[PDB]
Amino acid sequence: QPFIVLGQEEYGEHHSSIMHCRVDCSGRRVASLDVDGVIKVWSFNPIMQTKASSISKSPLLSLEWATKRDRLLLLGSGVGTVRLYDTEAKKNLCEININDNMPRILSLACSPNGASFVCSAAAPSLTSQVPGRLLLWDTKTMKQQLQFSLDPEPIAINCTAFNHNGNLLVTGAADGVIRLFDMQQHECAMSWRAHYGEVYSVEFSYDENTVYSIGEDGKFIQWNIHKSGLKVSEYSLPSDATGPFVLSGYSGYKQVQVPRGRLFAFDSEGNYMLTCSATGGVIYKLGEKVLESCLSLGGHRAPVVTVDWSTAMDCGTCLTASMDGKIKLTTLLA
Numbered sequence: 001q002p003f004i005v006l007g008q009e010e011y012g013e014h015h016s017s018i019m020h021c022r023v024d025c026s027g028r029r030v031a032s033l034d035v036d037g038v039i040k041v042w043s044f045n046p047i048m049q050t051k052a053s054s055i056s057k058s059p060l061l062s063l064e065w066a067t068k069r070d071r072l073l074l075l076g077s078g079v080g081t082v083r084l085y086d087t088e089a090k091k092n093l094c095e096i097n098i099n100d101n102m103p104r105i106l107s108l109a110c111s112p113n114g115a116s117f118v119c120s121a122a123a124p125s126l127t128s129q130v131p132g133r134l135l136l137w138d139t140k141t142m143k144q145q146l147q148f149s150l151d152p153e154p155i156a157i158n159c160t161a162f163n164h165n166g167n168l169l170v171t172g173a174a175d176g177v178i179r180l181f182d183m184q185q186h187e188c189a190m191s192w193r194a195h196y197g198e199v200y201s202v203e204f205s206y207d208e209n210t211v212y213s214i215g216e217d218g219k220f221i222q223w224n225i226h227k228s229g230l231k232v233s234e235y236s237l238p239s240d241a242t243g244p245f246v247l248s249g250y251s252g253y254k255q256v257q258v259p260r261g262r263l264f265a266f267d268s269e270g271n272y273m274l275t276c277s278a279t280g281g282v283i284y285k286l287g288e289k290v291l292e293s294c295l296s297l298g299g300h301r302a303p304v305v306t307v308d309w310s311t312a313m314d315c316g317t318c319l320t321a322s323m324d325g326k327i328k329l330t331t332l333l334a
Protein backbone atom coordinates (compact mmCIF):
# COMPACT_ATOMS: atom_id res chain seq x y z
CA GLN A 1 0.00 0.00 0.00
CA PRO A 2 1.98 3.06 -1.24
CA PHE A 3 -0.15 5.45 0.96
CA ILE A 4 -2.10 5.38 4.26
CA VAL A 5 -5.38 7.44 4.09
CA LEU A 6 -5.44 9.52 7.37
CA GLY A 7 -8.76 11.29 6.54
CA GLN A 8 -11.23 12.68 3.97
CA GLU A 9 -13.01 16.02 4.68
CA GLU A 10 -15.38 18.03 2.46
CA TYR A 11 -15.30 21.78 1.65
CA GLY A 12 -18.89 22.65 0.60
CA GLU A 13 -18.98 26.51 0.41
CA HIS A 14 -19.20 26.44 -3.47
CA HIS A 15 -22.79 25.90 -4.81
CA SER A 16 -21.67 25.71 -8.50
CA SER A 17 -19.38 23.35 -10.45
CA ILE A 18 -15.64 23.97 -9.71
CA MET A 19 -13.32 25.31 -12.47
CA HIS A 20 -10.03 25.44 -10.45
CA CYS A 21 -8.72 24.54 -6.96
CA ARG A 22 -4.99 25.06 -6.31
CA VAL A 23 -3.00 24.75 -3.03
CA ASP A 24 -0.72 27.79 -2.34
CA CYS A 25 3.13 27.43 -2.30
CA SER A 26 3.14 27.07 1.57
CA GLY A 27 0.82 23.99 1.24
CA ARG A 28 -1.64 25.44 3.81
CA ARG A 29 -4.20 27.50 1.72
CA VAL A 30 -6.60 26.58 -1.15
CA ALA A 31 -7.89 29.01 -3.79
CA SER A 32 -10.95 27.56 -5.53
CA LEU A 33 -13.09 29.09 -8.34
CA ASP A 34 -16.56 27.91 -9.48
CA VAL A 35 -18.40 28.61 -12.82
CA ASP A 36 -20.52 31.42 -11.17
CA GLY A 37 -17.19 33.34 -10.68
CA VAL A 38 -17.11 32.81 -6.83
CA ILE A 39 -13.49 32.79 -5.47
CA LYS A 40 -12.89 31.14 -2.04
CA VAL A 41 -9.53 31.21 -0.20
CA TRP A 42 -9.64 28.65 2.63
CA SER A 43 -7.43 26.81 5.15
CA PHE A 44 -7.83 23.04 5.86
CA ASN A 45 -5.10 22.34 8.53
CA PRO A 46 -6.00 22.00 11.31
CA ILE A 47 -9.70 22.55 10.23
CA MET A 48 -11.63 23.87 7.18
CA GLN A 49 -12.04 27.66 7.53
CA THR A 50 -12.85 30.26 4.81
CA LYS A 51 -10.26 33.14 4.92
CA ALA A 52 -11.61 35.16 1.94
CA SER A 53 -14.69 35.10 -0.35
CA SER A 54 -15.67 37.26 -3.41
CA ILE A 55 -18.09 37.00 -6.40
CA SER A 56 -16.54 38.45 -9.62
CA LYS A 57 -18.86 40.74 -11.68
CA SER A 58 -16.69 39.64 -14.68
CA PRO A 59 -16.29 35.93 -15.61
CA LEU A 60 -13.06 34.32 -14.17
CA LEU A 61 -11.20 31.69 -16.28
CA SER A 62 -7.86 31.08 -14.45
CA LEU A 63 -6.07 31.25 -11.11
CA GLU A 64 -2.37 31.05 -10.09
CA TRP A 65 -0.68 31.48 -6.68
CA ALA A 66 2.47 33.67 -6.54
CA THR A 67 5.65 31.61 -5.87
CA LYS A 68 7.64 33.89 -3.43
CA ARG A 69 4.76 36.09 -2.07
CA ASP A 70 2.55 33.26 -0.69
CA ARG A 71 -0.47 35.58 -0.09
CA LEU A 72 -0.68 36.95 -3.69
CA LEU A 73 -3.13 35.29 -6.14
CA LEU A 74 -3.29 36.04 -9.90
CA LEU A 75 -6.84 35.83 -11.40
CA GLY A 76 -7.44 35.74 -15.22
CA SER A 77 -10.83 37.09 -16.45
CA GLY A 78 -12.97 36.44 -19.56
CA VAL A 79 -12.84 40.25 -20.25
CA GLY A 80 -9.10 40.54 -21.11
CA THR A 81 -7.86 41.38 -17.53
CA VAL A 82 -5.41 39.97 -14.93
CA ARG A 83 -6.12 40.82 -11.25
CA LEU A 84 -3.48 40.64 -8.47
CA TYR A 85 -5.46 39.78 -5.27
CA ASP A 86 -3.93 40.03 -1.74
CA THR A 87 -5.57 37.11 0.20
CA GLU A 88 -4.21 38.51 3.58
CA ALA A 89 -5.49 42.15 3.12
CA LYS A 90 -8.53 40.72 1.19
CA LYS A 91 -8.28 43.41 -1.61
CA ASN A 92 -7.26 43.76 -5.31
CA LEU A 93 -3.78 45.42 -5.66
CA CYS A 94 -3.87 45.46 -9.48
CA GLU A 95 -6.06 45.07 -12.52
CA ILE A 96 -4.29 45.12 -15.94
CA ASN A 97 -5.99 45.04 -19.41
CA ILE A 98 -4.60 42.80 -22.25
CA ASN A 99 -4.52 44.62 -25.67
CA ASP A 100 -6.55 43.38 -28.71
CA ASN A 101 -9.77 41.40 -28.01
CA MET A 102 -8.30 38.14 -26.86
CA PRO A 103 -10.44 38.52 -23.73
CA ARG A 104 -10.12 34.88 -22.49
CA ILE A 105 -7.20 34.54 -20.00
CA LEU A 106 -7.06 30.69 -20.13
CA SER A 107 -3.70 30.09 -18.36
CA LEU A 108 -1.41 31.76 -15.74
CA ALA A 109 2.02 30.47 -14.56
CA CYS A 110 4.36 32.20 -12.07
CA SER A 111 8.12 31.61 -12.52
CA PRO A 112 9.69 29.77 -9.52
CA ASN A 113 12.12 32.72 -8.84
CA GLY A 114 9.11 35.13 -8.41
CA ALA A 115 10.42 37.60 -11.08
CA SER A 116 7.86 36.91 -13.90
CA PHE A 117 4.58 35.25 -14.93
CA VAL A 118 3.13 34.18 -18.30
CA CYS A 119 -0.50 34.24 -19.36
CA SER A 120 -2.32 32.93 -22.43
CA ALA A 121 -5.00 35.25 -23.88
CA ALA A 122 -7.29 33.71 -26.56
CA ALA A 123 -10.05 35.00 -28.89
CA PRO A 124 -13.66 33.93 -28.12
CA SER A 125 -14.31 30.18 -28.86
CA LEU A 126 -15.95 29.67 -32.33
CA THR A 127 -13.89 26.69 -33.67
CA SER A 128 -10.96 24.81 -31.97
CA GLN A 129 -8.54 26.93 -34.12
CA VAL A 130 -9.27 30.38 -32.53
CA PRO A 131 -6.23 32.71 -32.36
CA GLY A 132 -4.37 33.13 -29.02
CA ARG A 133 -1.23 34.81 -27.61
CA LEU A 134 1.36 33.97 -24.94
CA LEU A 135 2.46 37.03 -22.84
CA LEU A 136 5.50 37.38 -20.49
CA TRP A 137 5.04 39.81 -17.52
CA ASP A 138 7.57 41.33 -15.04
CA THR A 139 6.29 41.03 -11.40
CA LYS A 140 8.50 43.96 -10.15
CA THR A 141 6.73 46.53 -12.48
CA MET A 142 3.56 44.44 -13.24
CA LYS A 143 4.25 45.45 -16.92
CA GLN A 144 4.18 43.18 -20.02
CA GLN A 145 7.75 42.50 -21.38
CA LEU A 146 7.06 40.57 -24.63
CA GLN A 147 4.68 38.20 -26.50
CA PHE A 148 6.00 34.84 -27.86
CA SER A 149 5.30 34.15 -31.58
CA LEU A 150 3.32 30.88 -31.98
CA ASP A 151 4.04 28.74 -35.11
CA PRO A 152 2.49 27.99 -37.47
CA GLU A 153 -0.47 30.26 -36.42
CA PRO A 154 -1.67 32.22 -33.35
CA ILE A 155 -3.59 29.62 -31.23
CA ALA A 156 -5.24 29.35 -27.76
CA ILE A 157 -2.76 28.03 -25.12
CA ASN A 158 -4.80 25.93 -22.61
CA CYS A 159 -2.04 25.01 -20.12
CA THR A 160 1.44 26.18 -19.00
CA ALA A 161 4.05 24.82 -16.54
CA PHE A 162 7.57 25.99 -15.57
CA ASN A 163 10.41 23.53 -14.82
CA HIS A 164 12.10 23.72 -11.36
CA ASN A 165 14.62 26.56 -12.20
CA GLY A 166 12.09 28.36 -14.48
CA ASN A 167 14.38 28.37 -17.60
CA LEU A 168 11.84 26.15 -19.52
CA LEU A 169 8.06 26.64 -19.96
CA VAL A 170 5.99 23.79 -21.48
CA THR A 171 2.63 24.69 -23.09
CA GLY A 172 -0.34 22.80 -24.55
CA ALA A 173 -2.58 24.38 -27.19
CA ALA A 174 -6.04 23.98 -28.77
CA ASP A 175 -4.30 22.67 -32.01
CA GLY A 176 -2.93 19.64 -30.05
CA VAL A 177 0.66 20.98 -30.24
CA ILE A 178 3.03 21.07 -27.22
CA ARG A 179 5.48 24.02 -27.35
CA LEU A 180 8.57 24.17 -25.08
CA PHE A 181 9.95 27.72 -24.55
CA ASP A 182 13.50 28.63 -23.54
CA MET A 183 12.70 31.50 -21.09
CA GLN A 184 16.31 32.93 -21.26
CA GLN A 185 16.47 33.25 -25.12
CA HIS A 186 12.62 33.75 -25.27
CA GLU A 187 12.01 31.29 -28.15
CA CYS A 188 10.44 27.90 -28.95
CA ALA A 189 13.20 25.26 -28.32
CA MET A 190 10.89 22.33 -29.28
CA SER A 191 7.34 21.71 -30.57
CA TRP A 192 5.40 18.57 -31.70
CA ARG A 193 1.85 17.30 -32.42
CA ALA A 194 0.94 15.71 -29.02
CA HIS A 195 -2.84 15.06 -29.23
CA TYR A 196 -5.66 14.76 -31.78
CA GLY A 197 -7.79 17.58 -30.33
CA GLU A 198 -6.91 20.03 -27.52
CA VAL A 199 -4.06 19.57 -25.00
CA TYR A 200 -5.59 20.02 -21.48
CA SER A 201 -2.60 19.69 -19.05
CA VAL A 202 1.22 19.48 -19.25
CA GLU A 203 3.87 18.92 -16.53
CA PHE A 204 7.61 18.34 -16.23
CA SER A 205 8.58 14.99 -14.67
CA TYR A 206 10.41 15.17 -11.28
CA ASP A 207 13.75 14.35 -13.06
CA GLU A 208 12.71 16.74 -15.96
CA ASN A 209 13.82 14.13 -18.61
CA THR A 210 10.16 13.96 -19.77
CA VAL A 211 6.95 16.01 -19.99
CA TYR A 212 3.52 14.45 -19.32
CA SER A 213 0.40 15.52 -21.26
CA ILE A 214 -3.34 14.73 -21.27
CA GLY A 215 -5.59 15.73 -24.21
CA GLU A 216 -9.06 15.55 -25.79
CA ASP A 217 -8.23 12.17 -27.52
CA GLY A 218 -8.21 10.59 -23.98
CA LYS A 219 -4.44 9.79 -24.03
CA PHE A 220 -1.98 10.22 -21.14
CA ILE A 221 1.47 10.51 -22.83
CA GLN A 222 5.04 10.79 -21.52
CA TRP A 223 7.37 12.62 -23.99
CA ASN A 224 11.19 12.56 -24.30
CA ILE A 225 12.29 16.22 -23.61
CA HIS A 226 15.63 15.53 -25.50
CA LYS A 227 13.99 14.17 -28.76
CA SER A 228 11.02 16.17 -30.18
CA GLY A 229 7.77 14.12 -30.38
CA LEU A 230 9.44 10.85 -29.20
CA LYS A 231 7.04 9.07 -26.74
CA VAL A 232 8.42 7.27 -23.64
CA SER A 233 5.01 5.76 -22.72
CA GLU A 234 1.34 6.18 -23.68
CA TYR A 235 -2.00 5.12 -22.07
CA SER A 236 -5.70 5.38 -23.01
CA LEU A 237 -7.32 6.78 -19.82
CA PRO A 238 -10.93 5.89 -18.99
CA SER A 239 -13.22 8.50 -20.66
CA ASP A 240 -14.31 10.04 -17.28
CA ALA A 241 -10.62 11.21 -16.83
CA THR A 242 -10.88 13.74 -19.73
CA GLY A 243 -14.68 14.24 -20.14
CA PRO A 244 -16.57 16.07 -21.32
CA PHE A 245 -17.91 16.01 -17.71
CA VAL A 246 -21.76 15.74 -17.57
CA LEU A 247 -24.18 16.21 -14.59
CA SER A 248 -27.82 15.26 -15.56
CA GLY A 249 -31.24 15.37 -13.83
CA TYR A 250 -34.58 13.86 -14.98
CA SER A 251 -35.43 17.44 -16.17
CA GLY A 252 -33.89 17.08 -19.65
CA TYR A 253 -31.53 19.72 -18.13
CA LYS A 254 -27.77 18.90 -17.90
CA GLN A 255 -24.48 20.75 -17.25
CA VAL A 256 -21.46 19.91 -19.50
CA GLN A 257 -17.86 20.97 -18.56
CA VAL A 258 -14.91 20.49 -20.99
CA PRO A 259 -11.59 20.41 -19.08
CA ARG A 260 -10.33 23.89 -18.02
CA GLY A 261 -8.46 23.22 -14.72
CA ARG A 262 -5.61 20.68 -14.15
CA LEU A 263 -6.71 17.08 -15.07
CA PHE A 264 -3.68 15.51 -13.32
CA ALA A 265 -1.44 16.11 -10.27
CA PHE A 266 1.64 14.33 -8.80
CA ASP A 267 3.12 13.32 -5.42
CA SER A 268 6.27 15.21 -4.27
CA GLU A 269 8.68 12.76 -6.05
CA GLY A 270 6.44 12.26 -9.17
CA ASN A 271 6.07 8.46 -8.69
CA TYR A 272 2.23 8.69 -8.52
CA MET A 273 -0.46 10.56 -10.48
CA LEU A 274 -3.95 11.69 -9.33
CA THR A 275 -6.70 11.82 -12.05
CA CYS A 276 -10.48 12.57 -12.28
CA SER A 277 -13.25 9.92 -12.36
CA ALA A 278 -17.08 9.92 -11.99
CA THR A 279 -16.89 8.98 -8.22
CA GLY A 280 -13.55 10.52 -7.06
CA GLY A 281 -9.77 10.73 -7.54
CA VAL A 282 -7.99 7.69 -9.07
CA ILE A 283 -4.20 7.40 -8.36
CA TYR A 284 -1.82 5.46 -10.72
CA LYS A 285 1.82 4.39 -10.15
CA LEU A 286 4.06 5.82 -12.97
CA GLY A 287 6.40 3.10 -14.44
CA GLU A 288 2.28 -2.55 -17.97
CA LYS A 289 0.39 -1.66 -21.25
CA VAL A 290 -2.70 -1.36 -18.92
CA LEU A 291 -1.83 1.44 -16.36
CA GLU A 292 -1.64 0.38 -12.65
CA SER A 293 -4.57 2.00 -10.70
CA CYS A 294 -3.42 1.49 -7.04
CA LEU A 295 -5.76 3.84 -5.03
CA SER A 296 -9.36 5.17 -5.55
CA LEU A 297 -10.18 8.10 -3.19
CA GLY A 298 -14.01 7.94 -3.74
CA GLY A 299 -16.37 10.32 -1.87
CA HIS A 300 -18.06 12.14 -4.84
CA ARG A 301 -21.72 11.87 -6.06
CA ALA A 302 -20.96 14.02 -9.18
CA PRO A 303 -18.06 13.94 -11.69
CA VAL A 304 -14.59 15.14 -10.53
CA VAL A 305 -13.41 17.78 -13.07
CA THR A 306 -10.13 19.03 -11.47
CA VAL A 307 -7.51 17.76 -8.94
CA ASP A 308 -4.45 18.95 -7.00
CA TRP A 309 -1.83 17.14 -4.87
CA SER A 310 0.24 19.07 -2.26
CA THR A 311 2.92 17.82 0.23
CA ALA A 312 4.03 19.76 3.39
CA MET A 313 5.29 18.50 6.80
CA ASP A 314 5.80 14.99 5.22
CA CYS A 315 1.99 14.77 4.70
CA GLY A 316 0.23 14.74 1.28
CA THR A 317 -3.12 16.44 0.56
CA CYS A 318 -5.26 15.48 -2.52
CA LEU A 319 -8.00 17.87 -3.73
CA THR A 320 -10.82 16.37 -5.87
CA ALA A 321 -13.44 18.93 -7.11
CA SER A 322 -16.79 17.85 -8.63
CA MET A 323 -19.63 19.42 -10.72
CA ASP A 324 -21.87 19.72 -7.57
CA GLY A 325 -19.29 22.25 -6.19
CA LYS A 326 -17.99 19.79 -3.49
CA ILE A 327 -14.18 19.66 -2.84
CA LYS A 328 -12.91 16.49 -1.08
CA LEU A 329 -9.58 16.87 0.77
CA THR A 330 -7.90 13.45 1.30
CA THR A 331 -4.84 13.32 3.65
CA LEU A 332 -2.20 10.72 2.55
CA LEU A 333 1.01 9.70 4.39
CA ALA A 334 3.76 7.68 2.53
Ligand SMILES: *CCC(=O)N1CCCc2c(C(=O)NC3(c4ccc(Cl)cc4)COC3)cccc21
Binding pocket: 065, 066, 067, 069, 072, 074, 084, 093, 094, 095, 096, 110, 114, 117, 139, 140, 141, 142
Ligand atom coordinates in the same frame (compact mmCIF):
# COMPACT_ATOMS: atom_id res chain seq x y z
C1 LIG B 1 -0.85 46.80 -11.12
C2 LIG B 1 -0.12 48.01 -10.53
C3 LIG B 1 -0.34 48.27 -9.03
O1 LIG B 1 -1.28 48.99 -8.68
N1 LIG B 1 0.61 47.79 -7.99
C4 LIG B 1 0.35 48.07 -6.57
C5 LIG B 1 0.62 46.79 -5.69
C6 LIG B 1 1.01 45.57 -6.56
C7 LIG B 1 2.13 45.96 -7.55
C8 LIG B 1 3.49 45.27 -7.66
C9 LIG B 1 3.84 43.97 -6.91
O2 LIG B 1 3.25 43.61 -5.89
N2 LIG B 1 4.91 43.13 -7.42
C10 LIG B 1 5.32 41.89 -6.76
C11 LIG B 1 4.53 40.79 -7.30
C12 LIG B 1 3.39 41.01 -8.24
C13 LIG B 1 2.69 39.89 -8.74
C14 LIG B 1 3.08 38.58 -8.32
CL1 LIG B 1 2.35 37.20 -8.99
C15 LIG B 1 4.20 38.36 -7.41
C16 LIG B 1 4.92 39.47 -6.94
C17 LIG B 1 6.77 41.84 -6.86
O3 LIG B 1 6.81 41.49 -5.47
C18 LIG B 1 5.49 42.06 -5.33
C19 LIG B 1 4.48 45.81 -8.54
C20 LIG B 1 4.24 47.03 -9.25
C21 LIG B 1 2.95 47.71 -9.10
C22 LIG B 1 1.87 47.10 -8.29
